[PDB]
Scaffold this active site. Sequence first.
Site, mmCIF file in Angstrom:
data_model
loop_
_atom_site.group_PDB
_atom_site.id
_atom_site.type_symbol
_atom_site.label_atom_id
_atom_site.label_comp_id
_atom_site.label_asym_id
_atom_site.label_seq_id
_atom_site.Cartn_x
_atom_site.Cartn_y
_atom_site.Cartn_z
ATOM 1 N N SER B 81 0.811 -1.237 0.000
ATOM 2 C CA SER B 81 0.000 0.000 0.000
ATOM 3 C C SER B 81 0.874 1.333 0.000
ATOM 4 O O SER B 81 1.715 1.457 -0.906
ATOM 5 C CB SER B 81 -1.098 -0.119 1.063
ATOM 6 O OG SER B 81 -2.130 0.755 0.689
ATOM 7 N N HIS B 236 -7.712 -6.080 0.094
ATOM 8 C CA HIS B 236 -6.534 -5.272 0.211
ATOM 9 C C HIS B 236 -5.539 -5.890 1.181
ATOM 10 O O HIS B 236 -4.342 -5.960 0.890
ATOM 11 C CB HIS B 236 -6.925 -3.907 0.688
ATOM 12 C CG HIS B 236 -5.819 -2.933 0.680
ATOM 13 N ND1 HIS B 236 -5.171 -2.577 -0.462
ATOM 14 C CD2 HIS B 236 -5.251 -2.206 1.682
ATOM 15 C CE1 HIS B 236 -4.247 -1.687 -0.179
ATOM 16 N NE2 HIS B 236 -4.273 -1.450 1.108
HETATM 17 O O1 LIG Z 1 -3.728 0.511 2.915
HETATM 18 C C1 LIG Z 1 -3.515 1.278 3.780
HETATM 19 C C2 LIG Z 1 -4.483 2.301 4.110
HETATM 20 C C3 LIG Z 1 -4.270 2.915 5.324
HETATM 21 C C4 LIG Z 1 -5.167 3.850 5.755
HETATM 22 C C5 LIG Z 1 -6.272 4.140 4.956
HETATM 23 C C6 LIG Z 1 -6.479 3.493 3.744
HETATM 24 C C7 LIG Z 1 -5.574 2.555 3.310
HETATM 25 CL CL LIG Z 2 -1.551 2.657 3.191
#
Ligand SMILES: O=Cc1ccccc1
Ligand SMILES: [Cl-]
EC number: 4.1.2.10
Lengths: 259, 259
Positions: B81, B236
């Site tokens: 991510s 995810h």
């Molecule tokens: O994938 C990580 C992430 C973290 C905070 C908010 C949205 C996504």
């Molecule tokens: Cl993230």
Amino acid sequence: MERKHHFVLVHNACHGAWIWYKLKPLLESAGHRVTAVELAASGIDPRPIQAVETVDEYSKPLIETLKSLPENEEVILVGFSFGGINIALAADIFPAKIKVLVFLNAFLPDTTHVPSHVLDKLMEMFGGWGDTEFSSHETRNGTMSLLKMGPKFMKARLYQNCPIEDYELAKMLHRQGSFFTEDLSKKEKFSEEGYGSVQRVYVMSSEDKIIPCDFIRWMIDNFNVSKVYEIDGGDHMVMLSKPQKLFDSLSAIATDYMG
Amino acid sequence: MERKHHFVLVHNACHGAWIWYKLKPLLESAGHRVTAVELAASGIDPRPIQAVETVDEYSKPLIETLKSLPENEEVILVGFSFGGINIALAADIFPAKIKVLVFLNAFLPDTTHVPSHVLDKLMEMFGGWGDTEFSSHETRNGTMSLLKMGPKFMKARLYQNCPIEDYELAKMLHRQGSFFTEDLSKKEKFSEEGYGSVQRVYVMSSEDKIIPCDFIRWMIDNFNVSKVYEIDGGDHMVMLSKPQKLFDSLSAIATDYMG
Ligand SMILES: O=Cc1ccccc1
Ligand SMILES: [Cl-]
Ligand SMILES: O=Cc1ccccc1
Ligand SMILES: [Cl-]
């Protein structure tokens, strides 16, 4: 439908609310409410243990949890390991908010000796600490004895019956803590009117390599409980190695304190 | 037997090294080494994100990990991510220490636009933040934008294919974080000679509800990779929902860079 309960779960020193991640959904699927407290300097709590100089400070988030409950609500309060001490301190402040105390592989203090008595007794005969790191921190409250578990010690003595994944999780989350044994030895003894008035049961694992059977029997003999439940094959970290069987134990306690 | 590799795993914002607790033993059972880094103000680091003001400060534990490697060791560096941005920063510093970069459901920055480019694009596009709480904190060098996921958001957009225990665990451990958008906007472009020189591959989840499948092709179109691997059924949080398939993908990648 039998009426359900609100369980408040209290983790052990050097760990945090995360240890209940398996047990919490099991309890909630059965209809119960669960609050997994994060004690001070534990888990993701933003303080270091060096800033938490007394057991009262350490326990404050549990006291706050109980203080915030609506009028006349009562909970099943579950203390794990050093969490037996925290739940006793809580019971001496809000006895009427607790339906039953559950001492899970826990220190069971009494109302006759100083509150450190059952810890001091175990520490004298504890066996190996292995690769655990000991350190001191001097404060206005005196000198704090700190510890940080080593990984061989965790594997051998806490997590020996846990899936490898739980052990790796614990390696990534455990923190430096304290048993506050100095602070406890100078605190006023737990009261018969507070703590001593609250119903208690003890839940033990058969393969706890930290809190052995004979030591548990000694604690219960010094301070009786209404009933004892055994989890066959459990290591000390029984919420991680046998969470279903821990659920079954807690469920049986909840049926026993129906209404 | 095959030569084994050292995998360095870099988590996402708001999370920590704990996310890898299922994958690490899988990789280690196959003979590989694994280091799961904990970024600044993440996981159990008792430093708040407010104190970390820059992406370089955030990324320092990763930098330190690479610096500490013995001479000539190379690793497979996996960023998840926001971890995509951290691995790119690291590759601009120590390109010769990295056998390949694995962008796992990750932001894949380019060497043309300002380093915040892909994050700004996602923020413009994304409409599902739900109960996420956005906030600011003023530093001596400007506004720092912060976020704390909400639990409804987590369940719907990150963990929808995970076991309920993993979601409960995340609820107990996620933290306020940042994507450092302002800082990254002011930073020099990533370089061709560092980051752009390193081999890179993409591993995507087929049911990622935060980093949509089209947004991934857009990123890979802006900046190509050697190969794309797809994990069927992953959300995810694919190291939690499909850890054995992720292990499969990383084992294929390791075979492809026979070291
Ligand atoms: O994938 C990580 C992430 C973290 C905070 C908010 C949205 C996504
Ligand atoms: Cl993230
Ligand atoms: O049960 C918690 C504990 C923590 C550190 C050392 C020994 C026991
Ligand atoms: Cl403990």
